[PDB]
Structures are given as C-alpha cells and as structure tokens.
Paper text:
To facilitate structural determination of the [name]-V2-[name] interaction, we took advantage of the affinity maturation of the [name], which increases its affinity to [name] (PF3D7_1040300) to 6.2 nM, from lower than 1 µM. The crystal structure of the [name] V2 (PF3D7_1040300) in complex with [name] extended to 2.7-Å resolution, while negative-stain (ns)-EM 3D reconstruction of the [name] Fab complex with [name] V2 (PF3D7_1400600) indicated the Fab region not to be involved in [name] binding. The [name]-V2-[name] complex resembled a razor with an exchangeable cartridge, where [name] V2 is the “handle” and [name] is the “cartridge”. The [name]-V2 portion of the complex comprised 6 helices (α1-α6). Two longer helices, α1 and α6, and two shorter helices, α3 and α4, formed a four-helix bundle with helices α2 and α5 packed perpendicularly to the bundle. Helix α5 and its adjacent loops (α4-α5 and α5-α6) were connected by a disulfide bond (C254-C265) between α4 and α5; this region (hereafter referred to as the apex region) is likely located distally from the membrane, as the carboxyl terminus of the V2 region connects directly to the transmembrane. Comparison to the previously determined structure of ligand-free [name] (PDB 3KGR11) suggested the binding of [name] to induce conformational alterations in the C-C’ loop, although their overall structures were essentially identical with a root-mean-square deviation (rmsd) of 0.41 Å over all Cα atoms. Interestingly, the interface between [name]-V2 and [name] buried a surface area of 917 Å2 on each protein. The interface consisted of backbone-mediated hydrogen bonds and extensive hydrophobic interactions with highly complementary shapes matching between [name] and [name].
[name], a large family of Plasmodium variant surface antigens, plays a crucial role in malaria pathogenesis by mediating immune suppression through activation of inhibitory receptors such as [name], and antibodies with [name] inserts have been identified that bind infected erythrocytes through [name]. [name] also mediates immune suppression through activation of inhibitory immune receptors including leukocyte-associated immunoglobulin-like receptor 1 ([name]) and leukocyte immunoglobulin-like receptor B1 (LILRB1). Notably, human monoclonal antibodies that contain [name]-domain insertions in either switch region or between V and DJ regions have been isolated from donors, who have had malaria. To define the structural basis underpinning interactions between wild-type and antibody-inserted [name] and polymorphic [name], we investigated the overall architecture of three types of [name]-inserted antibodies, determined crystal structures of [name] in complex with the [name]-interactive regions from two [name] (PF3D7_1040300 and PF3D7_0401300), and used the resultant structural information to derive a [name]-binding signature and to identify [name] from diverse Plasmodium species capable of recognizing [name].
Residue numbers in the entry:
A (entry chain A): 108 to 205
B (entry chain B): 190 to 311
Write the structure that this text describes.
C-alpha cells in the first residue's frame, strides 16, 4: 500500500497573464479518492472528489481558476488520499502572473 | 418564591453558559468571518445552538481558505489546531467533525458550568 509521489502541472503554462485562466492538474495512481491542491501555506487548500481515470495506471484531478490576479501567484503542490492513508506531497510548482 | 428562584437561576445560567463558549468561538476566530455569524450568535443568545454554528463555520472556512481564494484571511491558521493538516500516511480527518468536536467541548463546558449556577442562586 505504499502510495507513489503524485505530480502537479499547469495548463496551459507556468506563466499566465493577469485576467487569463489556468488549470492545475494533479496526477497520481488509479483509485485515489480525494485530491488536494495546496499553496505554500499548508492551511490554504482545495479538496475535490471528482477524479478521472486517464489511464489503466494513472488518475487525475483538475483545479481551474477562470482568471488570475496577483494574489493567485505562488507555489502549488498536490496530495491525494487513497486506501485509508494520505499520500506524500508532490514537488512544488510556481505559477507567476504577468 | 420557588418559581422566581427557578426563573432567576435559568436566567443566570443562560447568561453565564454563553460567555465560556464565546471564548470558544473567538479561539477559532469566528470573529474574522465577514458573513457576521459570530455577531449574530452573540445578539440572539441560545448558546446550546453552538453545534449549529458549526456547519456554517465549515462552509465559510472552505470558501475563504481554498487554494483558489484571492488574498489571505486570518481564520485559515486555525486549521492546524483542528488537525486537518495531514502528515503523510495519516488518516483523513474531516474539518466539520473537528469543528463539531471543538464546540461540543465548548457546549458541555457550558452546560456543566451552567448547572452549578442554576443551583447556586436558589
Ligand atoms: Pt475523507
């Protein structure tokens, strides 16, 4: 039941102009029950229970903001909850607003 | 004479049972929410409705402490005390359940403190 390290990516990019949308993608193994997007301060997070099977071995969740402002910029990382235990956290991603 | 004593004891026990739990709510910083739930509870009394206050506290906190939110809000720090920040390999712990355990501690605090001053007056 060791849970693999998840990963974060940002679509369409790491750098977004003010007012545009961006989407954080958390990917992990199959069967994750909850995904959590976290900022640098651990107490600021979003949980979601919609996970989509991308692959027979992977699953993913999406957190979108419809338009950025300078308060959205910072470090972001994921954790997932599957099979009675929380996972390890992913590496940080920095999204910057222009 | 007995009636008036029971009524005065009920009044004293209500007013005193609420103060300890207002300490409880401002420990959670129900103070900083701009909905105004805190001020509303203090104006309307009815202290043992505190578990009611619980569910709104969750909804609002979820909205204002999300990774999406624009700006920083003082209430978010209280989550660490609630225990909803997870160590790797730990159980999930639901925020609403932690909030209800905080204010159940507050409410049984209040009831057994009010039971003494109900009997004290008479
Ligand atoms: Pt859960």
């Amino acid at each position: 039941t060791d849970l693999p390290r998840p990963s974060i990516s940002a679509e369409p990019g790491t750098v977004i102009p003010l007012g545009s949308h961006v989407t954080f993608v958390c990917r992990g193994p199959v069967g994750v029950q909850t995904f959590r997007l976290e900022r640098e301060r651990n107490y600021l997070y979003s949980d979601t229970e919609d996970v989509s099977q991308t692959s027979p071995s992977e699953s993913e969740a999406r957190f979108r903001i419809d338009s950025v402002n300078a308060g959205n910029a910072g470090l972001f990382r994921c954790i997932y909850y599957k099979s009675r235990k929380w996972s390890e956290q992913s590496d940080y991603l920095e999204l910057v607003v222009k | 004479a007995e009636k008036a004593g029971a009524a005065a004891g009920l009044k004293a026990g209500d007013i005193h049972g609420m103060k300890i739990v207002i300490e409880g709510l401002k420990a959670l910083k129900v103070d900083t929410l701009k909905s105004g739930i805190f001020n509303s509870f203090v104006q309307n009394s009815h202290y043992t409705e505190v578990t009611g206050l619980a569910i709104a506290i969750d909804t609002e906190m979820n909205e204002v402490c999300s990774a999406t939110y624009i700006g920083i809000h003082p209430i978010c720090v209280v989550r660490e005390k609630l225990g909803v920040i997870p160590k790797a390999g730990g159980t999930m712990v639901k925020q609403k359940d932690a909030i209800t355990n905080v204010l159940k501690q507050a409410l049984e605090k209040a009831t057994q403190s009010a039971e003494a001053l109900s009997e004290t007056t008479a």
